[PDB]
Amino acid sequence: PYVVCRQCPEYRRQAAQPPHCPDYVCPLQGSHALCTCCFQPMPDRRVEREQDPRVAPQQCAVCLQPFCHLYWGCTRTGCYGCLAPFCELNLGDKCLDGVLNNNSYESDILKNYLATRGLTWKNMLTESLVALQRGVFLLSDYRVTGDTVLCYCCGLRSFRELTYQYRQNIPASELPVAVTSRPDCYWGRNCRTQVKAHHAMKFNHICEQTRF
Ligand SMILES: [Zn+2]
Ligand SMILES: [Zn+2]
Ligand SMILES: [Zn+2]
Ligand SMILES: [Zn+2]
Ligand SMILES: [Zn+2]
Numbered sequence: 001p002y003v004v005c006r007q008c009p010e011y012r013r014q015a016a017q018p019p020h021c022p023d024y025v026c027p028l029q030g031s032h033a034l035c036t037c038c039f040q041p042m043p044d045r046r047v048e049r050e051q052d053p054r055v056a057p058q059q060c061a062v063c064l065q066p067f068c069h070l071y072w073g074c075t076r077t078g079c080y081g082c083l084a085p086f087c088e089l090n091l092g093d094k095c096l097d098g099v100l101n102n103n104s105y106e107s108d109i110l111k112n113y114l115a116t117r118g119l120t121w122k123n124m125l126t127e128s129l130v131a132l133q134r135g136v137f138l139l140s141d142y143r144v145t146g147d148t149v150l151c152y153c154c155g156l157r158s159f160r161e162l163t164y165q166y167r168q169n170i171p172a173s174e175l176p177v178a179v180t181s182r183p184d185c186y187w188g189r190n191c192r193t194q195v196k197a198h199h200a201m202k203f204n205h206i207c208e209q210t211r212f
Contacts, residue, residue, distance in 0.1 A: 087146035
């Protein structure tokens with residue numbers, strides 16, 4: 001497939017098939033990869049970077065998919081900045097929405113707790129990443145640190161896990177009594193019924209599956 005990117009030489013551009021009517025420059029033997037976020041081609045320089053750390057990262061260290069943001073700036077509605085060190089990743093203004101269990105009721109409780117104290121999601125992440133570094137909080141992607149260069153989706157996935165642990169560690173005395181009065185759901189954080197508003201309001205889902 002003929003491909004022309006931001007950094008392709010002019011001669012390449014003028015040789016593409018024409019439309020229908022009613023510092024780096026790409027070498028001949030080089031290749032292109034499509035940004036997983038914006039679908040636009042960029043020169044694929046990952047192999048080069050392996051022995052030259054001077055080349056900007058072009059992939060998420062967690063899912064290994066390519067993203068163009070650190071390399072030359074990605075633009076798309078819905079794109080907040082799709083590749084970054086985790087501690088600096090832009091998760092968007094709505095990242096607290098459904099952050100706990102995809103459960104708006106549980107999530108609103110956390111939003112209220114943070115807003116009451118004038119805290120932002122950023123403050124919560126910073127505190128959570130301190131705990132992560134001490135080994136007090138844990139991640140499924142267990143090798144991720146605040147310094148890992150990762151994408152929006154992988155960062156968000158870990159932010160949900162850190163946030164759940166942050167929530168877990170809030171003393172009951174610091175939450176409204178209407179929150180703490182609710183009995184634990186037998187099925188815990190993975191309950192499938194908590195997507196229904198009534199069930200979500202009735203039971204606490206910040207807990208684990210009941211076993212014995
Ligand atoms: Zn190119
Ligand atoms: Zn990723
Ligand atoms: Zn992009
Ligand atoms: Zn992007
Ligand atoms: Zn439940």
